Amino acid sequence: EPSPYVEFDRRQWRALRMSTPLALTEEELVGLRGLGEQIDLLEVEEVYLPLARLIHLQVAARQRLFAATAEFLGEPQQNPDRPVPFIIGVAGSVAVGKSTTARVLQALLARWDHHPRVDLVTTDGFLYPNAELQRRNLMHRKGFPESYNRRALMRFVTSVKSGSDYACAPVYSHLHYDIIPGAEQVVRHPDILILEGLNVLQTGPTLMVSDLFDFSLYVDARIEDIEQWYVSRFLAMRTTAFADPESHFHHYAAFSDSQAVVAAREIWRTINRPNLVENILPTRPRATLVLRKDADHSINRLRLRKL
Amino acid sequence: EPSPYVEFDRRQWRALRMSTPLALTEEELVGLRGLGEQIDLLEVEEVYLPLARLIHLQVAARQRLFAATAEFLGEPQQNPDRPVPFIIGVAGSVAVGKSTTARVLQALLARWDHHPRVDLVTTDGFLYPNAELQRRNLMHRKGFPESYNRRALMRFVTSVKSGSDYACAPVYSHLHYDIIPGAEQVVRHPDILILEGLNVLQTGPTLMVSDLFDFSLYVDARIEDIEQWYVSRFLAMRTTAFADPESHFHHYAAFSDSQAVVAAREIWRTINRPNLVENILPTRPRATLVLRKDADHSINRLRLRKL
Numbered sequence: 001e002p003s004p005y006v007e008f009d010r011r012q013w014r015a016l017r018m019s020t021p022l023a024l025t026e027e028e029l030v031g032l033r034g035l036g037e038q039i040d041l042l043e044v045e046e047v048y049l050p051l052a053r054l055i056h057l058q059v060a061a062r063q064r065l066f067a068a069t070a071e072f073l074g075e076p077q078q079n080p081d082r083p084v085p086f087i088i089g090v091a092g093s094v095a096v097g098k099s100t101t102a103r104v105l106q107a108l109l110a111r112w113d114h115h116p117r118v119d120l121v122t123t124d125g126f127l128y129p130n131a132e133l134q135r136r137n138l139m140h141r142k143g144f145p146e147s148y149n150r151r152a153l154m155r156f157v158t159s160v161k162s163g164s165d166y167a168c169a170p171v172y173s174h175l176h177y178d179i180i181p182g183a184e185q186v187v188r189h190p191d192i193l194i195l196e197g198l199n200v201l202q203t204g205p206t207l208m209v210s211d212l213f214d215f216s217l218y219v220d221a222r223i224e225d226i227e228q229w230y231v232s233r234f235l236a237m238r239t240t241a242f243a244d245p246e247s248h249f250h251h252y253a254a255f256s257d258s259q260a261v262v263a264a265r266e267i268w269r270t271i272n273r274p275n276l277v278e279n280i281l282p283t284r285p286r287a288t289l290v291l292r293k294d295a296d297h298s299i300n301r302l303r304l305r306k307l
Numbered sequence: 308e309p310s311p312y313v314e315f316d317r318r319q320w321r322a323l324r325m326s327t328p329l330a331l332t333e334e335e336l337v338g339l340r341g342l343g344e345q346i347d348l349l350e351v352e353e354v355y356l357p358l359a360r361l362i363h364l365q366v367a368a369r370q371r372l373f374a375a376t377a378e379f380l381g382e383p384q385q386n387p388d389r390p391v392p393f394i395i396g397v398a399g400s401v402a403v404g405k406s407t408t409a410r411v412l413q414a415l416l417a418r419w420d421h422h423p424r425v426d427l428v429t430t431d432g433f434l435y436p437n438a439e440l441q442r443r444n445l446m447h448r449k450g451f452p453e454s455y456n457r458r459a460l461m462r463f464v465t466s467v468k469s470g471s472d473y474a475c476a477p478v479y480s481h482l483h484y485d486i487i488p489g490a491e492q493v494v495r496h497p498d499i500l501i502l503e504g505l506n507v508l509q510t511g512p513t514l515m516v517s518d519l520f521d522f523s524l525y526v527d528a529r530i531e532d533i534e535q536w537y538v539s540r541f542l543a544m545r546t547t548a549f550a551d552p553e554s555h556f557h558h559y560a561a562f563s564d565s566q567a568v569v570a571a572r573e574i575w576r577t578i579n580r581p582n583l584v585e586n587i588l589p590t591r592p593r594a595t596l597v598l599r600k601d602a603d604h605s606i607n608r609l610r611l612r613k614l
């Protein structure tokens with residue numbers, strides 16, 4: 001029976017690369033790769049290149065839609081030096097690799113013929129300060145939809161897509177586990193804005209950020225595998241992030257493999273998994289493209305929305 | 308500050324008519340007008356004509372989007388004798404006039420230069436039979452999201468937009484207040500499908516009909532006004548629909564103005580209003596165009612989504 005989607009295996013998907021040129025060195029790929037990710041240039045070729053193609057094909061097609069409405073309104077026919085920003089959302093669980101996926105996407109798109117302005121913004125910057133979370137009693141729901149200033153987020157994305165000359169966003173520090181006082185990320189009328197976050201594909205009783213997406217990505221994986229990557233990355237951070245005396249979780253550095261496994265599992269069981277199950281996964285059906293990852297972090301299956 | 312919308316008054320909106328030709332007689336408008344509606348040809352000119360324009364401008368632009376994806380997929384470049392159906396949703400409360408709006412829209416679009424196949428389908432046909440509603444204990448929630456076979460509905464709309472040669476839908480009888488046994492509406496690869504219903508702009512944890520809309524309309528009005536139209540139409544039906552011995556509500560025919568006002572208010576208070584407040588209104592922010600109606604049923608304000 002009919003379906004809104006169409007599924008590919010890596011073999012079928014890479015065929016769609018065509019003449020798309022690889023403009024990324026191995027050393028650049030490394031500075032984009034997050035702890036735990038196994039992505040190599042081969043994957044950038046067989047998975048991320050066809051994706052970059054499909055996107056530029058549509059950046060063109062999506063512009064005709066705003067054209068048509070501008071014509072209808074009798075408005076001018078706006079500046080080709082400043083078209084309507086193309087918004088891309090990247091969603092998925094904690095520790096599934098969405099940040100790496102989003103950084104890689106930004107790199108490939110910024111290296112297209114013209115050299116379009118491609119900004120990347122994470123929703124982390126819109127989380128409430130820890131003091132405000134404790135106030136709202138949400139310290140153990142950090143990551144959940146309500147742990148974000150969704151109003152400020154929508155204001156930011158709306159501002160940008162509406163053609164503002166510049167829009168600002170707060171900044172989050174993973175090291176201190178909190179928002180940074182006075183820090184800001186300035187986005188200046190980019191050609192493309194990638195919004196990466198747990199909650200980005202979310203819908204609701206009010207117009208939301210996902211309603212402004214022109215394209216969306218959902219980095220997927222078997223839940224038991226994501227837990228493994230989570231715990232695994234947690235033990236690994238004892239000697240990276242947590243090893244920093246300034247780290248909010250510096251106490252975790254001295255944990256034993258066993259103590260660490262227990263702690264990481266409890267956090268996953270009580271916080272990230274519930275959120276993934278109750279809020280993130282339910283948004284997956286709406287993603288334009290779902291990148292399915294095998295236990296080895298490898299992307300071997302994809303689900304595209306044709307409707 | 309920036310906004311996803313742009314609001315017009317009738318004066319600003321009619322200006323956008325341009326050369327759009329009125330192809331509707333007064334007698335045809337009458338056979339489209341529902342009991343209680345005050346729509347005249349003037350409104351068809353100053354409100355529905357600009358709308359018909361904006362739509363054909365986009366039917367063209369929306370086709371480029373499926374083109375781009377077909378190109379990406381290396382697929383052919385499908386039959387201009389059978390393009391991807393353009394889906395239009397029409398939502399709003401009970402008794403706000405959405406059915407009239409949808410019939411009028413169908414008429415104007417079917418009378419465009421080529422003479423596109425424009426089918427109209429109401430979600431009434433997807434309600435569960437009364438016996439099944441009583442089973443589910445939903446007889447007093449008739450109209451609510453769960454009172455519909457949403458699975459069958461999504462199957463129907465997906466089938467159609469996916470290019471099926473024909474798709475079938477059940478049929479609902481307002482007279483008998485129930486689904487008609489064995490009746491079916493056949494939709495054969497129309498150029499445009501208008502889906503009219505209370506719940507159509509609804510979102511959820513699964514891909515839904517609203518996710519397949521290429522354009523959407525939300526017929527709006529002050530809630531106290533809609534109640535008035537509801538009660539008002541209820542008294543009026545004592546001598547139209549209810550006057551029919553075959554009518555499920557034939558007992559209502561003998562009610563006095565006073566008895567009738569009480570009954571209609573109770574039904575509105577306990578069923579339609581709650582649904583409007585809890586489920587329909589929350590979908591309004593997502594409609595492409597909101598037609599606001601004054602107490603006299605007149606459309607004097609509009610809200611368009613530019614983003």
Ligand SMILES: CC(C)(COP(=O)(O)OP(=O)(O)OC[C@H]1O[C@@H](n2cnc3c(N)ncnc32)[C@H](O)[C@@H]1OP(=O)(O)O)[C@@H](O)C(=O)NCCC(=O)NCCS
Pocket residue numbers: 033034035093094095096097098099100124142143174175197198241242249267271272
């Ligand atoms: C704060 C939070 C909502 C952020 O979610 P997120 O950024 O989507 O999580 P991700 O898995 O995508 O991680 C994003 C980046 O932050 C890094 N990171 C996560 N936690 C970190 C930490 N405590 N210190 C340093 N870096 C960290 C990830 O390694 C990743 O780095 P990369 O972009 O180079 O690959 C989430 O991490 C969180 O705290 N969730 C619930 C609370 C929790 O898990 N607490 C345990 C903390 S040890």
Ligand SMILES: CC(C)(COP(=O)(O)OP(=O)(O)OC[C@H]1O[C@@H](n2cnc3c(N)ncnc32)[C@H](O)[C@@H]1OP(=O)(O)O)[C@@H](O)C(=O)NCCC(=O)NCCS
Pocket residue numbers: 007008009220221222223290291292301302303
């Ligand atoms: C064990 C078994 C049933 C796999 O699970 P399933 O329940 O079949 O689901 P799938 O294999 O399609 O995929 C499993 C998960 O990966 C996802 N997935 C599969 N293909 C995907 C793709 N192309 N893109 C993204 N995600 C994909 C599924 O959506 C599901 O997601 P979730 O479990 O996180 O909700 C599998 O062994 C099987 O039988 N597959 C049917 C194939 C077949 O030959 N069938 C003949 C029947 S006679």
Ligand SMILES: CC(C)(COP(=O)(O)OP(=O)(O)OC[C@H]1O[C@@H](n2cnc3c(N)ncnc32)[C@H](O)[C@@H]1OP(=O)(O)O)[C@@H](O)C(=O)NCCC(=O)NCCS
Pocket residue numbers: 340341342400401402403404405406407431449450481482504505548549556574578579
């Ligand atoms: C069944 C129901 C869900 C249908 O909703 P709906 O079709 O969106 O309601 P609308 O206000 O759009 O009415 C659509 C059409 O059906 C007509 N209609 C509504 N109820 C009718 C009835 N009992 N008998 C005959 N026609 C009726 C309306 O006049 C309108 O006609 P038109 O298209 O020519 O203008 C809704 O009417 C309902 O029953 N809601 C809750 C129960 C209720 O109100 N019961 C009181 C019945 S008197």
Ligand SMILES: CC(C)(COP(=O)(O)OP(=O)(O)OC[C@H]1O[C@@H](n2cnc3c(N)ncnc32)[C@H](O)[C@@H]1OP(=O)(O)O)[C@@H](O)C(=O)NCCC(=O)NCCS
Pocket residue numbers: 314315316527528529530597598599608609610
């Ligand atoms: C009484 C008063 C406040 C009206 O209500 P409001 O609370 O202002 O809301 P609006 O007048 O914009 O509209 C009222 C309703 O109609 C809707 N509406 C207004 N314009 C609309 C449009 N263009 N399209 C669709 N709907 C519209 C609103 O969304 C609202 O919907 P809802 O009540 O069903 O949720 C009005 O008298 C007023 O003060 N308007 C402000 C105009 C003005 O001159 N302000 C100067 C302030 S110093």
Ligand code: NA
Pocket residue numbers: 119186187188189190
């Ligand atoms: Na910028």
Ligand code: NA
Pocket residue numbers: 426493494495496497
């Ligand atoms: Na047909």
